[PDB]
DNA sequence: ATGTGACTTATAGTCCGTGTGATTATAGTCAACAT
DNA sequence: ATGTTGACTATAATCACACGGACTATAAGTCACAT
């Protein structure tokens, strides 16, 4: 569907595994539904900047380093 | 409101201006509503990635250039 | 399958709803997985007395009270 | 160990005796292993409901009578 | 008769994830009138 | 030109649940040898 979305959803998962988190921890720490974290990674889903922020806080990661990894993923072949 | 959401909006407005675009024209170029655009720039909207993407295409700016800028703006 | 199991299964759910609990709450307080609580109610799984005991403690109900409702459900038409 | 588990077992042993059965015979009647039964009666086993059901069949006691008894036993 | 121990094998119970209908909050989109 | 106020309607986001596969702990079932 959307170019950027699958990149965002890819990076959320990448970080989540890097930090040895599971989906449902992240769902807690991000103060969003269990199934939403799944749905974001699983398919992609069209999240909101506010929701993205919540997830970033949950990944225990800064806006900045998130976007830095976002850029790197976009740039790949 | 949100810090990120504010910086996003600021960035959208910044790029629109360094390109000498009007809102009217930013909305024409991305096929969204001008009041919608207005709203974002006065930070009254919490856009989705999809919408953000349409706005980048309307600004004629790559995702990467946008985020490069968004990062810099984020750091005061 | 087993006669007693689906009865035990039924009564666990009945109580759980009577107390306005959700599976999530229950598996919570029973310190079992929410998958297992679902599994039990769903497909009448074959639990252990120890696990049943945990569920009773989770339902905030006593041995006695449970077995009294168990007897009732068995007796029904 | 568990409180319930001990009284299940106690009950199983109680009924086997009130009937005049040996373990050997409770095992035969319920098509289970004798050491299996001995284990339960010394309370070294944590039955599943299914197993309990087989032991009730062997004792020839309905679920209801078993639980009526277990309750009474439970209340000291 | 019953009670051990110790040793496989079935399965109970765990852990992480997928996929889904139904409801609620809210973004997406477009009016009217402002300046 | 841009701002703001309501609106309607799509959909983001929530909530309670089912379902699967893979792995770990342990109950199920059977030996040998006590007594
Ligand atoms: Mg719009
Ligand atoms: Mg056995």
Numbering used by the authors:
A (entry chain C), C (entry chain B): 2 to 78
B (entry chain D), D (entry chain A): 2 to 77
From the manuscript:
The C-protein C.Esp1396I is a member of a large class of helix-turn-helix proteins that act as transcriptional regulators of gene expression in both prokaryotic and eukaryotic systems. C.Esp1396I finely regulates a bacterial restriction-modification system, providing a delay in endonuclease expression via a concentration-dependent ‘on’ and ‘off’ switch. The C-protein–DNA operator complex consists of two ‘controller’ C-protein dimers (chains A and B, chains C and D) bound to a 35 bp DNA operator sequence (chains E and F). The dsDNA is distorted in the complex, due to binding of protein dimers to each operator site, resulting in minor groove compression (leading to a 50° bend at each binding site) and large major groove expansion at the DNA sequence centre.
Here a model protein–DNA complex C.Esp1396I is employed to investigate specific damage mechanisms for protein and DNA in a biologically relevant complex over a large dose range (2.07–44.63 MGy). To investigate the distribution of specific damage throughout the C.Esp1396I protein–DNA structure with respect to increasing radiation dose, eight successive datasets on the same C.Esp1396I crystal were collected, each exposing the same 100° wedge of the crystal to X-ray radiation. The final model for the first dataset was refined to a resolution of 2.8 Å. In agreement with the original structure, each asymmetric unit contained one tetrameric protein–DNA complex and had a solvent content of 68.7%. At low doses the protein was observed to be susceptible to radiation damage while the DNA was far more resistant, damage only being observed at significantly higher doses. Residues such as Asp, Glu, Met and Ser can be seen to accumulate significant damage (loss of electron density around the Ser side chain –OH) even at the lowest doses.
